[PDB]
Amino acid sequence: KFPRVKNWELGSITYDTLCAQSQQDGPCTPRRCLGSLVLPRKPAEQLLSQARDFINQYYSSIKRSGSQAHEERLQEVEAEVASTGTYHLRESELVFGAKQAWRNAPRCVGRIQWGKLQVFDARDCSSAQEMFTYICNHIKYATNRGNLRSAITVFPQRAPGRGDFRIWNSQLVRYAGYRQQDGSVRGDPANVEITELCIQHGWTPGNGRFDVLPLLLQAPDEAPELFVLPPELVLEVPLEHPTLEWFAALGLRWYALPAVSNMLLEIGGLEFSAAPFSGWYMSTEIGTRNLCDPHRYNILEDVAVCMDLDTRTTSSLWKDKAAVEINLAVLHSFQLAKVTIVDHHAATVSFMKHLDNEQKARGGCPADWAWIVPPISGSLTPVFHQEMVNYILSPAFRYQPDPW
Amino acid sequence: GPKFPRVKNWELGSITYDTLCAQSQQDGPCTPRRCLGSLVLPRPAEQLLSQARDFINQYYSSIKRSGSQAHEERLQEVEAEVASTGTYHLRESELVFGAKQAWRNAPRCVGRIQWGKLQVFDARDCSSAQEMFTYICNHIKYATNRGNLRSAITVFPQRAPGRGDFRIWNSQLVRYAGYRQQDGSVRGDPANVEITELCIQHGWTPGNGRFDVLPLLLQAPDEAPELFVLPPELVLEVPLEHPTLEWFAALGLRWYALPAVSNMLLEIGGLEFSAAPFSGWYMSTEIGTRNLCDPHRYNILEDVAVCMDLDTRTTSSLWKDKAAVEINLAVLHSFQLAKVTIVDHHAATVSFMKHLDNEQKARGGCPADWAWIVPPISGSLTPVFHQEMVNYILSPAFRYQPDPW
Ligand code: HEM
Ligand code: HEM
Ligand SMILES: Cc1cncn1-c1nccc(CCNCCCc2cccc(F)c2)n1
Ligand SMILES: Cc1cncn1-c1nccc(CCNCCCc2cccc(F)c2)n1
Ligand SMILES: C[C@H](O)[C@H](O)[C@H]1CNc2nc(N)[nH]c(=O)c2N1
Ligand SMILES: C[C@H](O)[C@H](O)[C@H]1CNc2nc(N)[nH]c(=O)c2N1
Ligand SMILES: [Zn+2]
């Protein structure tokens, strides 16, 4: 029926009834659970039913369901689809839709903030150059001299029989990965492919471990264009450790603004192929995943040797000890630089509060346990002991294929 | 391409497909509309025979005699046995194969690399509570082997139609008492409050330490559970010290050497073994992180953090992370120093990756519960974190069963 949901630290029990509002299939079946997969394996009446549903959500949200404005707006959408095969959102609807998509993102531990989202309408964009302007303003607004603010910029929706607006980069700010033919990678190995694409479209590359990539922006059915971000827009933080004086000598640094730029935003059946969004980092993303993942910067050993740890055996927990100091360094360095950041304990604590708010407001909260639980110190955080139900609600952020 | 779940490792870039999940006969809790994978407990002669037939087929396949005369005869013999009695009985070597296959099939166990080397003690002749005690003692002695731990399971008589179950009431063969205090707090292990009060109701004279070993509550068919005290010499324990933090030994912490799950039901070919305790050896995080640091367990994080002089007033000091690491180190160090088998979370997950590759070759997949396979500290530091997994129920299986009270 409805999932009985238990917190094992407190003994408390809720029931998720919100999951019944799911109109889209995830990857699981009763025969096997596929909840740990990162990516999904893969007319007019369909659009119209998604359209009416969203419009209903919207007017419900402003406490005007049934109103004259509500019924009229349904007919507008209905008349537009019947004639054209599609329709258009009003800005206020778009602002709401973007917020709900964030709110519905089962993987996001930052959703306590969902009601506080600056939404830039960039639907009047006609060129890659214009996209760059918008993106530049997004970054300036979002960065705010280190007092980070959540923001999204929405570019023109997809249209039948026309190429998409796309930002080719996976993030607005990311470091290059230069493949040296001696097998290794200088920089971020996660970005080798995007770095190569940039070079091939005429970018002159560097040879550092932290070269900020240029943007590849694509207007419909046009080759993408290359744009170098003004260095004064890309706030970065030098990494140092509060006690380990040698740590700074590693030359490590990270950027302030995390901004996902390759996800698709779906509202009322409309799809926005370019809708980059930014918030602020939770520290483990940088300290654990970006810096310690074996397929990323992979600095664990370097730090562990500097700490004179025993790298010979697993049972000395050198990896665990190194990781902790690296995350400490990130938190310290960001705090010293007055750049917004949240540690995983604060983050998960606020998410629990969010789970509680959502239970009262909607009867549940879609959450992906494997992503909510931080990459270090799992059971040391409250979300570890909290059962979670995972499902797709719309509006939603989706993955979409790389445009190349 | 293929009509099977595609499984990816994101560290290595490699791809497999799970074909083994196609042999699953029992549904888990998920649907296309919502994933319940993170939930701890998710909610006739014909049914018996088809399950019996399945297991017999599995057995004969394993010894490469599928289709043989002996295979068809065993099939007919099981069928005729069920037809006259309503149940049937396993041959010893069938019981051995099934026990190992149940372990092999356990999606949550990171220790499955060892599945082939289980020692199976056949106790299907056991006819009393006193006798269960003897078998359990023998199990503990054999499995402990003075610190050089050996995997083992002891199998007691199956559920019989119109007969009471053999049940061990304790969740583990060795566990510490949890004494509810007048102030609302708990002396010992809070996990074990109920079982402690059940032992008292049944005549146990309770201690009052943080680490009092519980007596066993053993139940032979249609009889009241009887109380049995484990002789302390049989119960090997390890005092906890830290290799550089000299004060840690003064915390007076300890843990028992032998982990032995005693309240799970072993299901094979539709037969149900309601008492079949199994033991292995600990992965260090089980002790250092879960048992010692869980808020609702011993909860020693703050104490240790204070001893280390950390800033426990703010999350961003990572005082929890720091303490937790030192506690896990202490567990590993102490067990090594006492020469008691233990495996850290790195070694364990590496060995599990190897297991996954073995099983890919051997069966075309391996059912696995990501949330349980990933350790509770240092998650993405271990290789399994970056390994997608497919979770599904295969039989023979270990399954939860309601508490007998
Ligand atoms: C404001 C502070 C925020 C914090 C601290 C935060 C934190 C996180 C974290 C830790 C993840 C895990 C995924 C990963 O490891 O990359 C995540 C995922 C995600 N977040 Fe947030 N987030 C924030 C803001 C936002 C905003 C403003 C949006 C959109 C409007 C958003 C939407 C999403 C989505 C769609 C995912 C899933 C991405 C994927 O599946 O690859 N978050 N977030
Ligand atoms: C040999 C060394 C072994 C190691 C290191 C090991 C490790 C683990 C760990 C860490 C878990 C996580 C469950 C928890 O947190 O409580 C687990 C679960 C499990 N293990 Fe093992 N195990 C070993 C041997 C065995 C044996 C011999 C059996 C049975 C014959 C077994 C059957 C199971 C089962 C059924 C579960 C799931 C329990 C549940 O769902 O509550 N394991 N194992
Ligand atoms: C800006 C933001 C707000 N919330 C999270 N982020 C955020 N910031 C920075 C980075 C990310 C990563 C989001 N998930 C992306 C990784 C998932 C994958 C999907 C396909 C292929 C891959 F290699 C990896 N998220
Ligand atoms: C002996 C062994 C072999 N493999 C694992 N173990 C092992 N040893 C010692 C302990 C455990 C715990 C296994 N899972 C225990 C069940 C945890 C729960 C599940 C639901 C409700 C609860 F209160 C508690 N496993
Ligand atoms: C296989 C597994 O699902 C995958 O590695 C996930 C696990 N949890 C994660 N959690 C976060 N926050 N980010 C991630 O990229 C992942 N990766
Ligand atoms: C809520 C969550 O499912 C629960 O705490 C699970 C998560 N993973 C686990 N993993 C292991 N190994 N042991 C556990 O008890 C749990 N508990
Ligand atoms: Zn699932």
* The three-state (H, E, C) secondary structure of chain B, written as one string: CCCCCEEEECCCCCEEECCHHHHCCECCCCCCCCECCCCCCCCCHHHHHHHHHHHHHHHHHHCCCCCCHHHHHHHHHHHHHHHHHCCCCCCHHHHHHHHHHHHHCCCCCCCHHHHHHCEEEECCCCCCHHHHHHHHHHHHHHHHHHHCCCCEEEECCCCCCCCCCCEECCCECCCECEEECCCCCEEECHHHHHHHHHHHHCCCCCCCCCCCECCEEEECCCCCCEEECCCHHHCCEEECCCCCCHHHHHHCCEEECCCEECCCEEEECCEEECCCCEECCCEHHHHHHHHHHCCCCCCCHHHHHHHCCCCCCCHHHCHHHHHHHHHHHHHHHHHHHCCCCCECHHHHHHHHHHHHHHHHHHHCCCCCCHHHHCCCCCHHHCHHHHECCCECECCCEEECCCCCC
Contact of B227 with chain A, judged by CB distance below 8 Å, is answered with: no
Helix (H) or strand (E) holding A48: helix A44-61
Compare all CA atoms of chain B with the CA of A2 and give the residue at the minimum distance. B34
- What is the rounded distance in angstroms from the CA atom of residue B292 to the CA atom of residue B324? 9
Least Cα distance to A15 among A326, A387, A284 occurs for A387
Could you tell me if B176 and B214 are in contact, meaning their C-beta atoms sit under 8 angstroms apart? yes
Tokens in use for B289?
């992180």
- Pairwise CB contact (< 8 Å): B34 & A25: no
In angstroms, what is the span from residue A260 Cα to ligand 3's centroid? 6
Q: Which residues of B342-371 are buried (b: 16+ CB within 10 A; e: fewer)?
A: bbbbbbbbbebbebbeebbeebbbbbbbbb
In angstroms, what is the span from residue A97 Cα to ligand 1's centroid? 16
Contact of B206 with chain A, judged by CB distance below 8 Å, is answered with: no
Q: Using CA of residue B265, residue B267, residue B270, residue B272, what is the dihedral sign?
A: negative
Least Cα distance to A320 among B81, B228, B285 occurs for B285
Name B273's bridge partners: B266
- What is the rounded distance in angstroms from the CA atom of residue A50 to the CA atom of residue B202? 62
> Which atom of ligand 6 approaches the CA of B373 most closely?
12
Least Cα distance to B372 among B405, B354, B394, B348 occurs for B348
- What is the rounded distance in angstroms from the CA atom of residue B273 to the CA atom of residue B95? 11
Contact of A336 with chain B, judged by CB distance below 8 Å, is answered with: no
Phi and psi for A287 in degrees, rounded to 5? -70, -40
Identify which of A379, A386, A388, A389 to mutate to test ligand 6's pocket (most ligand atoms within 8 A of the CB).
Answer: A379
Asked whether residue A33 is marked as a ligand-binding residue, the answer is yes
Question: Closest Cα of chain B to A21: distance in Å?
Answer: 9
Q: Provide the number of CB pairs (under 8 Å) joining chain A to chain B.
A: 211
How far is CA B137 from its chain centroid? 19
Q: For the range A136-144, what are the long-range contacts, defined as Cβ-Cβ under 8 Å and sequence gap of 24 or more? A: A136/A229, A136/A230, A136/A233, A138/A172, A138/A259, A138/A276, A138/A278, A139/A172, A139/A173, A139/A229, A139/A233, A139/A234, A139/A257, A139/A259, A139/A278, A140/A233, A142/A118, A142/A257, A142/A259, A142/A278, A143/A233, A143/A235, A143/A256, A143/A257
Tokens in use for B1?
């391409």
Cis amide prior to A276 (ω within 30 degrees): no
Active site residue B109: yes
Helix (H) or strand (E) holding A398: strand A396-398
Could you tell me if B125 and B92 are in contact, meaning their C-beta atoms sit under 8 angstroms apart? no
Q: Which residues of B151-187 are buried (b: 16+ CB within 10 A; e: fewer)?
A: bbbbbbbbbeeeeebbbbbbbbbbbbbbbeeeeeebb
Contact of A4 with chain B, judged by CB distance below 8 Å, is answered with: yes
Residue with tokens 């935003």: A265
Least Cα distance to B238 among B352, B332, B128 occurs for B332
Could you tell me if B400 and B265 are in contact, meaning their C-beta atoms sit under 8 angstroms apart? yes
- What is the rounded distance in angstroms from the CA atom of residue B104 to the CA atom of residue B116? 8
Contacts of B21 in chain A (CB under 8 A): 31-32
In angstroms, what is the span from residue A152 Cα to ligand 1's centroid? 12
> Which atom of ligand 1 approaches the CA of A279 most closely?
1
Helix (H) or strand (E) holding A254: strand A253-255
Tokens in use for A36?
């740990």
Cis amide prior to B396 (ω within 30 degrees): yes
Tokens in use for A316?
């000395």
- What is the rounded distance in angstroms from the CA atom of residue B298 to the CA atom of residue A313? 28
Tokens in use for B62?
């394993």
How far is CA B327 from its chain centroid? 23
> Which atom of ligand 5 approaches the CA of A371 most closely?
10
C-alpha neighbours within 13 Å on the C-beta side of residue A32: 25
Q: Using CA of residue B67, residue B71, residue B76, residue B82, what is the dihedral sign?
A: negative
- Is the shortest distance between the CB of A223 and ligand 3 below 6 Å? no
- What is the rounded distance in angstroms from the CA atom of residue A277 to the CA atom of residue A262? 10
What one-letter code names the amino acid at B13?
A: G
Q: How far is CA B286 from CA A8, A368, B110, B345, in A?
A: 16, 23, 11, 9
Q: Which residues of A272-285 are buried (b: 16+ CB within 10 A; e: fewer)?
A: bbbbbbbbbbbbbb
Q: What is the CA radius of gyration of chain B?
A: 23
- Resolution, expressed in angstroms to one decimal: 2.3
Q: Please tell me whether residue A357 adopts helix, strand or coil conformation.
A: helix
Could you tell me if B118 and B102 are in contact, meaning their C-beta atoms sit under 8 angstroms apart? no
Structure method: X-ray
Q: Please tell me whether residue A386 adopts helix, strand or coil conformation.
A: strand
What one-letter code names the amino acid at B203?
A: G
Least Cα distance to A362 among A98, A45, A60, A150 occurs for A60
Residues in chain A: 404
Helix (H) or strand (E) holding A215: strand A215-218
What one-letter code names the amino acid at B228?
A: F
The CB density around residue A42, as the number of other CB atoms within 10 Å, is 4
Give me the residue from B316, B383, B388 closest to A37, CB to CB.
B388
Q: How far is CA A172 from CA A149, A276, A277, in A?
A: 15, 8, 9
Q: Please tell me whether residue A144 adopts helix, strand or coil conformation.
A: helix
Could you tell me if B319 and B311 are in contact, meaning their C-beta atoms sit under 8 angstroms apart? yes
Q: How far is CA B358 from CA A26, B104, B116, B352, in A?
A: 29, 12, 12, 10
- What angle in degrees, to the nearest 10, is found between the helix axes of A44-61 and A91-103? 90
- 10 Å CB burial of residue A307 (0-12, 13-18, 19+) is middle
Name B272's bridge partners: B267
Tokens in use for A244?
């380990």
- Pairwise CB contact (< 8 Å): A343 & B318: yes
Tokens in use for B379?
């998650």
Helix (H) or strand (E) holding A81: helix A68-84
Q: Which residues of B304-321 are buried (b: 16+ CB within 10 A; e: fewer)?
A: bbebeebeeeebbbbbbb
Active-site option among B286, B319, B326, B366: B286
Compare all CA atoms of chain A with the CA of B297 and give the residue at the minimum distance. A9
Contact of A265 with chain B, judged by CB distance below 8 Å, is answered with: no
Residue with tokens 């207007």: A219
- Pairwise CB contact (< 8 Å): A391 & B296: no
Name B238's bridge partners: B255
- What is the rounded distance in angstroms from the CA atom of residue A89 to the CA atom of residue A267? 9
Compare all CA atoms of chain B with the CA of A295 and give the residue at the minimum distance. B11
How far is CA B20 from its chain centroid? 22
Q: Which domains does chain B carry?
A: 18-124+151-161+265-279+349-373 (3.90.340.10), 125-150+165-236+400-404 (3.90.440.10), 237-259+282-347 (3.90.1230.10)
Active site residue A318: no
Could you tell me if A207 and A178 are in contact, meaning their C-beta atoms sit under 8 angstroms apart? yes
Phi and psi for A215 in degrees, rounded to 5? -85, 140
Contact of A246 with chain B, judged by CB distance below 8 Å, is answered with: no
Max Cα–Cα distance, chain B, nearest Å: 72
- What is the rounded distance in angstroms from the CA atom of residue A34 to the CA atom of residue B388? 8
Pocket of ligand 6 (CB under 6 A): A 8, 384-387; B 38, 40, 371-372
Name B187's bridge partners: B179
Tokens in use for B51?
């399950």
Residues in chain B: 405
Q: Count each helix (H run) and each strand (E run) in chain A, helices first.
A: 11, 16
Phi and psi for A282 in degrees, rounded to 5? -90, 135
In angstroms, what is the span from residue A183 Cα to ligand 6's centroid? 39
B231: left (phi over 0), alpha (psi -120 to 50) or beta: beta
Q: Whose CA is nearest to atom 3 of ligand 1?
A: A110
Could you tell me if A321 and A238 are in contact, meaning their C-beta atoms sit under 8 angstroms apart? no
- Pairwise CB contact (< 8 Å): A314 & B347: yes
- Pairwise CB contact (< 8 Å): B380 & A288: yes
In angstroms, what is the span from residue A370 Cα to ligand 1's centroid? 14
Q: Using CA of residue B65, residue B67, residue B69, residue B75, what is the dihedral sign?
A: positive
The CB density around residue B22, as the number of other CB atoms within 10 Å, is 14
Q: Please tell me whether residue A341 adopts helix, strand or coil conformation.
A: coil
Tokens in use for A119?
């939404």
